Design an enzyme around this catalytic site. Structure first.
Site, PDB file in Angstrom:
ATOM      1  NE  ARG A  61      30.795  10.864  29.252  1.00 61.56           N
ATOM      2  CZ  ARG A  61      31.478   9.598  29.102  1.00 61.56           C
ATOM      3  NH1 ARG A  61      32.522   9.408  28.789  1.00 61.56           N
ATOM      4  NH2 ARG A  61      30.673   8.740  29.280  1.00 61.56           N
ATOM      5  CE1 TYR A 116      24.911  14.833  20.645  1.00 60.18           C
ATOM      6  CE2 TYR A 116      25.593  13.927  22.861  1.00 60.18           C
ATOM      7  CZ  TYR A 116      24.679  14.040  21.920  1.00 60.18           C
ATOM      8  OH  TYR A 116      23.666  13.399  21.734  1.00 60.18           O
ATOM      9  CE  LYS A 159      28.614  12.711  32.803  1.00 58.13           C
ATOM     10  NZ  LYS A 159      27.595  12.361  33.989  1.00 58.13           N
ATOM     11  CG  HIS A 179      28.240   9.215  37.658  1.00 57.89           C
ATOM     12  ND1 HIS A 179      28.544   8.216  36.515  1.00 57.89           N
ATOM     13  CD2 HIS A 179      27.355   9.804  36.838  1.00 57.89           C
ATOM     14  CE1 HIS A 179      27.750   8.333  35.614  1.00 57.89           C
ATOM     15  NE2 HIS A 179      26.759   9.374  35.710  1.00 57.89           N
ATOM     16  CB  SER A 229      26.260   2.989  30.497  1.00 62.61           C
ATOM     17  OG  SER A 229      26.819   1.815  29.966  1.00 62.61           O
ATOM     18  CB  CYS A 245      22.051   0.425  35.212  1.00 62.55           C
ATOM     19  SG  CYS A 245      23.716  -0.737  35.312  1.00 62.55           S
ATOM     20  CG  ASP A 254      24.423  12.553  35.375  1.00 68.77           C
ATOM     21  OD1 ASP A 254      24.756  11.460  35.575  1.00 68.77           O
ATOM     22  OD2 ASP A 254      24.999  13.426  34.575  1.00 68.77           O
ATOM     23  NE  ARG A 282      22.840  11.949  26.151  1.00 73.28           N
ATOM     24  CZ  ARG A 282      23.320  11.399  27.352  1.00 73.28           C
ATOM     25  NH1 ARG A 282      23.130  12.003  28.465  1.00 73.28           N
ATOM     26  NH2 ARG A 282      24.243  10.483  27.399  1.00 73.28           N
TER      27      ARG A 282
HETATM   28  C1  LIG Z   1      19.334   0.282  30.255  1.00 70.39           C
HETATM   29  C2  LIG Z   1      17.937  -0.128  30.037  1.00 70.39           C
HETATM   30  C3  LIG Z   1      17.469  -0.532  31.411  1.00 70.39           C
HETATM   31  C4  LIG Z   1      15.656  -1.324  31.400  1.00 70.39           C
HETATM   32  N1  LIG Z   1      15.338  -1.437  32.696  1.00 70.39           N
HETATM   33  C5  LIG Z   1      15.349  -0.412  33.870  1.00 70.39           C
HETATM   34  O1  LIG Z   1      15.355   0.586  33.493  1.00 70.39           O
HETATM   35  N2  LIG Z   1      14.918  -0.732  34.899  1.00 70.39           N
HETATM   36  C6  LIG Z   1      15.128   0.528  35.810  1.00 70.39           C
HETATM   37  C7  LIG Z   1      14.198   1.181  36.496  1.00 70.39           C
HETATM   38  C8  LIG Z   1      13.111   1.664  35.544  1.00 70.39           C
HETATM   39  C9  LIG Z   1      12.134   2.136  35.828  1.00 70.39           C
HETATM   40  C10 LIG Z   1      11.479   2.295  37.415  1.00 70.39           C
HETATM   41  C11 LIG Z   1      12.608   1.979  38.090  1.00 70.39           C
HETATM   42  C12 LIG Z   1      13.767   1.396  37.952  1.00 70.39           C
HETATM   43  F1  LIG Z   1      14.589   1.201  38.579  1.00 70.39           F
HETATM   44  C13 LIG Z   1      14.977  -1.949  35.651  1.00 70.39           C
HETATM   45  O2  LIG Z   1      14.424  -2.182  36.905  1.00 70.39           O
HETATM   46  C14 LIG Z   1      15.040  -3.062  34.784  1.00 70.39           C
HETATM   47  N3  LIG Z   1      15.010  -4.254  34.636  1.00 70.39           N
HETATM   48  C15 LIG Z   1      14.979  -4.918  33.295  1.00 70.39           C
HETATM   49  C16 LIG Z   1      14.993  -6.496  33.312  1.00 70.39           C
HETATM   50  C17 LIG Z   1      13.373  -6.692  32.817  1.00 70.39           C
HETATM   51  C18 LIG Z   1      12.569  -7.352  33.676  1.00 70.39           C
HETATM   52  C19 LIG Z   1      11.192  -7.686  33.363  1.00 70.39           C
HETATM   53  C20 LIG Z   1      10.525  -7.257  32.231  1.00 70.39           C
HETATM   54  N4  LIG Z   1       9.205  -7.520  31.762  1.00 70.39           N
HETATM   55  S1  LIG Z   1       8.307  -6.714  30.875  1.00 70.39           S
HETATM   56  O3  LIG Z   1       7.206  -7.103  31.232  1.00 70.39           O
HETATM   57  O4  LIG Z   1       8.983  -6.833  29.434  1.00 70.39           O
HETATM   58  C21 LIG Z   1       8.544  -4.729  31.117  1.00 70.39           C
HETATM   59  C22 LIG Z   1       8.720  -3.630  30.522  1.00 70.39           C
HETATM   60  N5  LIG Z   1       8.458  -2.651  31.191  1.00 70.39           N
HETATM   61  C23 LIG Z   1       8.590  -1.112  30.910  1.00 70.39           C
HETATM   62  C24 LIG Z   1       7.782  -2.912  32.416  1.00 70.39           C
HETATM   63  N6  LIG Z   1       7.854  -4.436  32.241  1.00 70.39           N
HETATM   64  C25 LIG Z   1      11.577  -6.642  31.078  1.00 70.39           C
HETATM   65  C26 LIG Z   1      12.935  -6.428  31.452  1.00 70.39           C
HETATM   66  N7  LIG Z   1      15.557  -4.054  32.478  1.00 70.39           N
HETATM   67  C27 LIG Z   1      15.231  -2.941  33.058  1.00 70.39           C
HETATM   68 MN   LIG Z   2      26.354  10.397  33.681  1.00 70.58          MN
END
Ligand SMILES: CCCCn1c(=O)n(Cc2ccccc2F)c(=O)c2[nH]c(Cc3ccc(NS(=O)(=O)c4cn(C)cn4)cc3)nc21
Ligand SMILES: [Mn+2]
EC number: 4.1.1.32
Length: 602
Positions: A78, A226, A235, A255, A277, A279, A302, A396
């Site tokens: 996008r 895309y 969107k 959203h 994005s 999060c 989404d 994706r």
């Molecule tokens: C954009 C990429 C975001 C990745 N990610 C994330 O996606 N979540 C969201 C989330 C993911 C899964 C389930 C619920 C949920 F709310 C989060 O709550 C989240 N928190 C963090 C920071 C963080 C905090 C601790 C660790 N420790 S770790 O032990 O490396 C780890 C990796 N995995 C998969 C599980 N433990 C690694 C990263 N990174 C996160």
């Molecule tokens: Mn979206």
């Protein structure tokens, strides 16, 4: 004269409104053929087939009916800077910022858009079949659902729309003679081609343009095949066009993910959430909760359409039929339920493919057997020693929601699901507590408005809708504000969360992932009946459930420093005042002020 181009369905059996729309653009674009989509499985089969045969898709033989599309590297996401909304008054679309250029939308006059359109669309489909996609956003026969019609010269669009929406002849029947959104799309490459073709993926990046005319109820998209650019129900319709309709009709097009959460006693609540994005939005939508006895079900990952019912409940539908998630980072650890969802009947884009016919991507977390090899998304042999990723970051999966192992029993109820809490979110490595609660609806609207998030640089994303506002953000704020006056409104508690705060050493304070269920537990009970602070309520000391966690540095995690929040509120007031300016509701000016006064006393 046009009936002789139709290779499927019947002009005659089309509602009058539909037939005229089609005939009008069929005439303008000049596709050799017209294919009225019936949405049947057999049709899908013959399309995948045609596509396989034309070198467009390639089957992933490791799975039950999965496919891989690879794109032109110039067409991989996008793209905001070619996206506009066309109104008579610019002001209806975006506020007039004090300083320079608006970050809140991109307006284009009808005059300028007349010329732009005519410079692109005539005869743009020569050599191609125009497909006619009838689709419903939301369950068929739900009073909350709206209907669209997408004309496209892209079989990829057609097959993806079959997954991401309810599509087919049954939509024409639910639609009858009523209203619908008119969606037109063209990859912009008539045959014979004028420029070379990469990865058999027709696109025209130079003339790429995605425009919405809210007043004519049209979405017109040229030059890209895309995701958010071509799948017009997603969107363009479901957020940009819907926000306008929702504003006219007294509901909300947002959203937000929606999930249902059950506690050990069996009490269930639905929660909605807006995240910028980076999060883990989708990861949260399908959370496997770490707390014992708790259940999390997925309604949508989404977009959420929310409308008060006769009884006063803010009920939500997922206007979508599938997930269009980012692949890189999806693993059994970060997201086991996504992994099972996409095991079959799934279309992938710009992922790597392994030598035994599976898919691959960074963060997939999965050892390959001995001597299994990898082809990157650029269609080249790949090693972990190339520096570059095997899958494009925006690559994706496009997968049916019905296949999600935890999909909510009511993910498709025509009556929607009662939302009892609205969550806003961001990635703030510093300053912002793991979680807190709004002081009121009015203050809640402001928390939404004040959202910022890390992307090296910290950026504003009010409501996570910054790229998606269908109209003046100022008037959008007033629209949210008025929801409090809806007769007998059972208004959701409003929360703000942040998984991403770090200690002085640069290390995250909160274990996140499944542990975020401890944060939802707090919200859940707060919804049923806290420590007051300048930014809202945080949990009382010992109110958060940390059983089974390590030692958590709560103090620092929930610290609220004047020095920080001085800077924060100043940045927020400046942003909103420069950018929303004359359209900034006075009630928002008061929330700013109030925040400032609570902060200056700390
Ligand atoms: C954009 C990429 C975001 C990745 N990610 C994330 O996606 N979540 C969201 C989330 C993911 C899964 C389930 C619920 C949920 F709310 C989060 O709550 C989240 N928190 C963090 C920071 C963080 C905090 C601790 C660790 N420790 S770790 O032990 O490396 C780890 C990796 N995995 C998969 C599980 N433990 C690694 C990263 N990174 C996160
Ligand atoms: Mn979206």
């Amino acid at each position: 004269n046009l009936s002789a181009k139709v290779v499927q369905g019947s002009l005659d059996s089309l509602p009058q409104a539909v037939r005229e729309f089609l005939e009008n653009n069929a005439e303008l674009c000049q596709p050799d053929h017209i294919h009225i989509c019936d949405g049947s499985e057999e049709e899908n089969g013959r399309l995948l087939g045609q596509m396989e045969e034309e070198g467009i898709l390639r089957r992933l033989k490791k799975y039950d009916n999965c496919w891989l599309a690879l794109t032109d590297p110039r067409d991989v996401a996008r793209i905001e800077s070619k996206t506009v909304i066309v109104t008579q008054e610019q002001r209806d679309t975006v506020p007039i910022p004090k300083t320079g250029l608006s970050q809140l939308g991109r307006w284009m006059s009808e005059e300028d858009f007349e010329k732009a359109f005519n410079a692109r669309f005539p005869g743009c489909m020569k050599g191609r079949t125009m497909y006619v996609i009838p689709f419903s956003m939301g369950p068929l026969g739900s009073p909350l659902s709206k209907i669209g019609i997408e004309l496209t010269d892209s079989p990829y669009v057609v097959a993806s729309m079959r997954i991401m929406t309810r599509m087919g002849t049954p939509v024409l029947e639910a639609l009858g003679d009523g209203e619908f959104v008119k969606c037109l799309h063209s990859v912009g490459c008539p045959l014979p081609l004028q420029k070379p073709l990469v990865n058999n993926w027709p696109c025209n990046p130079e003339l790429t343009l995605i425009a919405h005319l809210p007043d004519r109820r049209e979405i017109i998209s040229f030059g890209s095949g895309y995701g958010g650019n071509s799948l017009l129900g997603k969107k363009c319709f479901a957020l940009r066009m819907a926000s306008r309709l929702a504003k006219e009709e007294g509901w909300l097009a947002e959203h937000m993910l929606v999930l249902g959460i059950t506690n050990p006693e069996g009490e269930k609540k639905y929660l909605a959430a807006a995240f910028p994005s980076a999060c883990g939005k989708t990861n949260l939508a399908m959370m496997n909760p770490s707390l014992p006895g708790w259940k999390v079900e997925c309604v949508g990952d989404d977009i959420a359409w929310m409308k008060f019912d006769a009884q006063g409940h803010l009920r939500a539908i997922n206007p979508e039929n599938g997930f269009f998630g980012v692949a890189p980072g999806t693993s059994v650890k970060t997201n086991p339920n996504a992994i099972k969802t996409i095991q079959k009947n799934t279309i992938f884009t710009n992922v790597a493919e392994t030598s035994d016919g599976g898919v691959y991507w960074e963060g997939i977390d999965e050892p390959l057997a001995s001597g299994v090899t990898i082809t990157s998304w650029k269609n080249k042999e790949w090693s972990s020693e190339d520096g570059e990723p095997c899958a494009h970051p925006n690559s994706r999966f496009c997968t049916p929601a019905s296949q999600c192992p935890i999909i909510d029993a009511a993910w498709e109820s025509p009556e929607g699901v009662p939302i009892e809490g609205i969550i806003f979110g961001g990635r703030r490595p510093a300053g912002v507590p793991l979680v807190y609660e709004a002081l009121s609806w009015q203050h809640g609207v402001f928390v939404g408005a004040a959202m910022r998030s890390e992307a090296k640089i910290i950026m504003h994303d009010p409501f996570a809708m910054r790229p998606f506002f269908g109209y003046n953000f100022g008037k959008y704020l007033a629209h949210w504000l008025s929801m409090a006056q809806h007769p007998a409104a059972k208004l959701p508690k409003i929360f703000h969360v942040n998984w991403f705060r770090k200690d002085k050493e640069g290390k995250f304070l909160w274990p996140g992932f499944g542990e975020n269920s401890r944060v939802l537990e707090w919200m859940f009970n707060r919804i049923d009946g806290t420590k007051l602070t300048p930014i809202g309520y945080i949990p009382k000391e010992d109110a958060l459930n940390l059983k089974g966690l390590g030692h958590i540095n709560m103090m620092e995690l929930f610290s609220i420093s004047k020095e920080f929040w001085d800077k924060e509120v100043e940045d927020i007031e400046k942003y909103l005042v420069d950018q929303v300016n004359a359209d900034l509701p006075c009630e928002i000016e008061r929330e700013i002020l109030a925040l400032k006064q609570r902060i200056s006393q700390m």
